């Protein structure tokens, strides 16, 4: 009942029968070729409507491929909710393109399309006093509201509220379902139980986000200044969630590493009212607020961070909150500096909530944060579209409708991440590495094949290449000694596991401000959670990387955005994986999911000067034997 039932409609209806089935006669006068029983849409060069089609099909369905002649199609039942977020004339999509589609459309898919598009969309959600209220899109909503018990626990019997409807809206119901019905006021704590039943009772509803109902009458001043940054794909995908001027809190799976904070500081300061920013852990969020926000508009002195151990400005922060999921709602709130924050978070209005890769954490801690605070808007900058808080009542529909998904080629190619490059360098193995492959039989060799120095040699060119090409380098290597075993090799101010900050602050003031230093790195501590810096060249090494949800998080995140079109590949990527290994399957599975979502994946095992670069430290296979007495001990 509480399992994620409605989320996974995408990729369905892939079947057909040659001998038994029949064919739509319209193929001859059929510019397009869409298969509903097969789930794909082959709109090749003969299908010229890809402009509207890509506009409509991307919303309605999933892109199977991106062929030059024409892209491919995926049966997006989830795109049905995505198309549900569009709301255009339904017949035109089925009909206007239907002329191009020579074969007939899928009937069971159409029945599923009816179920997917508007079928799971009309249960009940009334609007009360500039927010959601006690009503329904259908009288069953009111009748179910009449039967509402968990929903009924925290509602004002008045049809709506002015201050309560502003504040209580028993929490923010600004994401309520089909309105224009009599309501009843909603109190100021706990819509969790309101949405508790909807998980188990499955209220299939047509919702929206009444953005201006996030009035948040007291405007807690922010700094809406151009100190923060932005690149064009944001002001498209943001404009997707911004809507027409009136910024709507929508659902945006935002990779941290796509100008994620850039989205917020635009958006948050745009609200110019009391905002809550939130990352994972008190130790983790510290890095998060640090390394972007001050070149950006934010000053640390006001974005207060609590732990119940870090007594900070709660009830006194002249500025908004950047917060830690660990601090906010978890058992280890074993003191009070965190406690009064919620009392203050109840005490103070909050117009914006920022969520970062919360797919890491169960909603048990998360929905705890949302059960009293009584905010006005939230924002889940999701990491992987499949997560552990996206149950039948998904997080994809508590903030607002879908507005951003795995399509960077249309979006990111706006100069924001234009000319997106993904490459999987297949480093040939050597005797000792394969003798190590021969040696042991466990996942500890993950440490004994990540250790490739030719991978450093290839990356060392990328250093010198982007030393000269003027591209920003990111190296994803959670290793520590091997990093230092290579940080000595590569030779730049090194970021290492458990680095004190100011050196990295020097290293990143050598990244945002200086150029004599031309390389940086990421460990299992910076990520997470450092605001990923400027990116035109990415190196990734780990490929087992539990989980794939973390990997699907890892995909868009380790490669940050770049307001760049000058570089022929304004975001280089390099998956330095020694070929003929265990993670070869993992990197190739990554490589598929590299090419699955549109990220322009490639493979270059013949590097431009792989060995021609200097400082080939430890190059000889006997050298590769000399130090191998160390790595096996891991």
């Amino acid at each position: 009942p509480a399992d994620f039932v409605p989320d996974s409609v995408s990729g369905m209806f892939r079947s057909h029968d040659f001998s038994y089935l029949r064919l739509r006669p319209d193929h001859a006068s059929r510019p397009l070729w869409i298969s509903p029983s097969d789930g794909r849409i082959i709109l090749e060069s003969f299908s010229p409507l890809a402009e509207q089609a890509q506009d409509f099909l991307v919303t309605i369905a999933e892109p199977i491929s991106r062929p030059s002649h024409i892209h491919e199609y995926k049966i997006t039942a989830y795109s049905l909710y995505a198309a549900v977020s569009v709301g255009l004339e339904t017949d035109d999509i089925i009909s206007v393109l239907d002329r191009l589609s020579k074969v007939p459309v899928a009937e069971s898919i159409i029945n599923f399309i009816k179920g997917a598009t508007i079928s799971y969309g009309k249960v009940k959600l009334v609007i009360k006093h500039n927010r959601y209220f006690v009503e329904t899109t259908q009288a069953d909503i009111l009748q179910m509201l009449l039967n509402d018990s968990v929903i009924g626990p925290l509602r004002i019997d008045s049809d709506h509220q002015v201050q309560p409807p502003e504040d209580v809206l028993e929490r923010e119901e600004e994401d309520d379902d089909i309105d224009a019905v009599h309501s009843f006021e909603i109190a100021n704590e706990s819509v969790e139980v309101v949405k508790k039943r909807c998980q188990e009772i499955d209220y299939p509803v047509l919702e929206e986000y009444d953005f201006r109902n996030d009035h948040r009458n007291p405007d807690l001043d922010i700094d809406l200044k151009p100190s923060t940054q932005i690149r064009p794909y944001q002001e498209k995908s943001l404009s997707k969630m911004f809507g027409n001027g009136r910024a709507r809190s929508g659902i945006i799976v935002l990779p941290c590493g796509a100008g994620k904070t850039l989205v917020g500081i635009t958006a948050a300061c745009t609200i110019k009212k009391s905002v809550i920013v939130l990352c994972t852990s008190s130790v983790s969020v510290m890095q998060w607020r640090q390394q972007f926000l001050q070149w950006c508009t934010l000053q640390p002195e006001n974005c207060a961070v609590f732990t119940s151990d870090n007594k900070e400005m709660f009830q006194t922060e002249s500025g908004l909150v950047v917060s830690t999921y660990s601090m906010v709602a978890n058992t280890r709130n074993r003191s009070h500096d965190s406690q009064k924050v919620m009392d203050f978070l109840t005490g103070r209005e909050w117009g914006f909530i920022i969520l970062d890769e919360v797919h890491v954490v169960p909603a048990a801690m998360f929905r705890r944060v949302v059960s009293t605070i009584a905010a006005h808007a939230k924002l889940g900058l999701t990491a992987t579209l499949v997560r552990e808080d996206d149950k039948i009542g998904d997080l994809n529909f508590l903030i607002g409708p879908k507005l951003y998904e795995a399509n960077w080629m249309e979006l990111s190619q706006k100069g924001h991440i234009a000319n997106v490059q993904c490459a999987e360098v297949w480093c040939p193995m050597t005797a000792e590495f394969y003798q190590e492959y021969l040696r042991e039989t466990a996942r500890k060799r993950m440490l004994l094949y990540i250790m490739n120095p030719t991978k450093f040699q290839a990356c060392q060119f990328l250093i010198q290449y982007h030393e000269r090409r003027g591209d920003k380098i990111i190296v994803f290597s959670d290793n520590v000694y091997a990093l230092q075993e290579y940080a000595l090799k590569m030779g730049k101010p090194f970021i290492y596991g458990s680095t004190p900050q100011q050196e990295r602050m020097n290293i990143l003031q050598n990244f945002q401000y200086n150029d004599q230093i031309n390389t940086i790195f990421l460990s299992k501590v910076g990520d997470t959670s450092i605001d990923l810096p400027e990116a035109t060249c990415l190196i990734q090494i780990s490929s087992h990387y539990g989980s794939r949800r973390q990997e699907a998080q890892r995909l868009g995140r380790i490669l940050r955005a770049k307001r760049r079109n000058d570089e022929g590949f304004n975001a280089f990527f390099y998956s330095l994986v020694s070929k003929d290994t265990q993670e070869m399957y993992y990197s190739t599975k990554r490589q598929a999911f590299l090419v699955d979502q549109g990220y322009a994946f490639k493979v270059i095992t013949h590097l431009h000067g792989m060995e021609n670069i200097p400082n080939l430290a430890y190059a000889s296979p006997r050298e590769r034997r000399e130090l191998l007495q160390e790595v096996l001990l891991k």
Partner: protein, 111 residues
């Protein structure tokens, strides 16, 4: 206007702007003979009336909000304007609601 109304009967008033042609008879308290508007007999567009309520931000943009600057509206206007300078040929004019309002937007756009 009453004495000039009084002195003569044959009087001609015309405009390409007057709309509606009924306020003025109400305003100046007189009876005309023909209250008719002429339309441009053009087989070609020759002018594109454009109502930019929504900018690139798709923000409902206005001058009624204040006589002051708000970069959300203003910088949007400034960003909106510049693209014309590239595409438009010689000849392009703006018309502020107020000269003081004109100067208000000038300095920060200069900034």
């Amino acid at each position: 206007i009453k004495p000039v109304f009084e002195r003569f009967s044959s009087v001609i008033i015309t405009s390409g702007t007057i709309s509606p042609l009924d306020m003025y008879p109400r305003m100046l308290n007189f009876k005309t003979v023909l209250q008719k508007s002429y339309a441009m007999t053009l087989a070609k567009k020759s002018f594109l009336p454009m109502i930019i309520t929504k900018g690139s931000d798709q923000v409902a943009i206005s001058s009624r909000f204040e006589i002051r600057n708000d970069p959300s509206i203003v910088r949007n206007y400034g960003s909106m304007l510049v693209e014309f300078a590239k595409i438009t040929p010689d000849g392009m004019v703006v018309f502020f609601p107020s000269y003081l309002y004109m100067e208000s937007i000038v300095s920060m756009w200069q900034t």
